[model samples]
Target: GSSGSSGERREKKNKIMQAKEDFKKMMEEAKFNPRATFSEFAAKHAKDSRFKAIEKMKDREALFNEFVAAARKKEKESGPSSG
Candidate 1:
């Protein structure tokens, strides 16, 4: 006998959230440049396994945008940028 899922909805959200984090790690590891946009990421990774669990396109972009924003913030802290 196999274990069953009693909380399908709960796990659905949990699984997708995990996928979001998985996608987060993808960018984190890549350490993309501040100049590039989410579209560029998708262009190369549109078929990435991360999107399989992450259903919505917008969700991916939102995560990427926030990641980019944070990376850029660290940029100023790390070096000189012309204001």
Candidate 2:
């Protein structure tokens, strides 16, 4: 039982590390600093209840992904119009 528990813990640790690495790579691919972008996003949505709730969450990766999703949705809604 102890061995199984240790194995599970190791798996969880590996997954977390992989997620962190992937996030860093994604930030590089996007060519923008995540700290600045997230800060701006939070400021823009300061009065938004959903954004506020996300900010209160404990998982940074999940929050970052949610922020990206919100930004993508906003971009689609306000994309440049073709003349």
Candidate 3:
């Protein structure tokens, strides 16, 4: 009964893809800026992998929730120290 409407599903998919693109850009920037913090680069790599994996999964809601939860957990853990 909870299946997303087509528009909602497509939007979520696009969001995930967009996130992947952002991560890729961050990694590229990090590569050019050797002084970039290791934590920052590592976080982007983690996000890139997570978004890519979610995009590959056919189940939209489940995969989306999985990525969202992981991202939330990371945010909470990073807290004030996040760069």
| Best candidate according to lDDT | 1
**Where is model 2 poorest over a 10-residue stretch in terms of lDDT?**
1-10
Query: Model 1 misses residue 7 by how many Å?
Result: 21
Tens digits of per-residue lDDT for model 1, 5-83: 2333445346766776788877788887979766777777667777555665666666676677678885444322377
Cα lDDT of model 3 by residue, 1-83, tens digit: 33222333355346756665564454445443434443453445545554344343334344333344444455544232356
Q: In model 3, how large is the Cα lDDT of residue 8? A: 31
lDDT of 2: 0.46
Clashes of each: 0, 0, 0
Clashes of 3: 0
- Where does candidate 2 stray beyond 4 Å? 1-12, 33-36, 39-83
Q: lDDT of each structure? A: 0.66, 0.46, 0.44
Poorest 10 consecutive residues of model 1 by lDDT?
1-10
Off by over 4 Å in 3: 1-12, 32-40, 43-83
